[PDB]
Amino acid sequence: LQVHLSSTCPQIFSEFLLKLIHILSTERGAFQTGQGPLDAQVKLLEFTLEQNFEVVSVSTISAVIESVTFLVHHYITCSDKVMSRS
Amino acid sequence: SITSFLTVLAWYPNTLLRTWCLVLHSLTLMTNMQLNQESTAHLLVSDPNLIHVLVKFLSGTSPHGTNQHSPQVGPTATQAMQEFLTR
């Protein structure tokens, strides 16, 4: 997908991918509850890292950053009471 | 006092399971109390925050759970909830 439409318009796809990120981390999302393929998630996110985000709209980046910060803060502060090693 | 506890529990997310059993134990203990003449059980049931706390309790999300293998609460919590509901 990236190699086929990067020539024309990667920006709109970047906006779509950020929309996916927002919906997967919103209220009652999959990421917070921990379900879903972990390997797929890490592969998509690492692939996302390599994209260029030059002309992405400010509103969607602001929405995704606020959502992820709230989720991760509530995760770290309310972290688990035990931890098991092998 | 009861309204304050129920609203803060319903509002507060990520309440641990050990705290959940402590809460359940205290709720049995407080329900044994009378108030000074409608019953306390009717008051506790009437408000919807009891729905919200029970939904949180029975959903067993555990959003910090690195070990979400068995969402079971253990026999102690099950016996505590059963006696509570019997009350």
Please spell the DSSP secondary structure of chain A, one letter per residue.
-HHHHTTT-HHHHHHHHHHHHHHHSSTT-HHHHT-S-HHHHHHHHHHHHTS--TT--HHHHHHHHHHHHHHHHHHHHT--S-----
Question: Which residues of A fall within a CB distance of 8 Å from B18?
Answer: 81
**B54 to each of A51, B26, B58, B85, how far by Cα in Å?**
44, 15, 6, 12
Helix segments in B1-87, DSSP class H? 2-11, 17-32, 40-46, 49-59, 75-86
Sequence-separated (6 or more) residues with CB below 8 Å from residue A29: A23, A71
Measured CA to CA in angstroms, residue B6 lies from A78, B47, B57 at distances of 20, 9, 13
- Tell me the structure's resolution in angstroms, rounded to a single decimal: 7.2
Q: What's the gap in Å between the CA of A10 and the closest CA on chain B?
A: 34
Experimentally, the structure was elucidated by cryo-EM
**Residue matched to tokens 């359940």:** B24
Preceding-residue numbers of gaps in chain A (C–N over 2.5 Å): none
Question: Cβ separation of B63 and A80 shorter than 8 Å?
Answer: no
Nearest CA in chain A to B59: A33
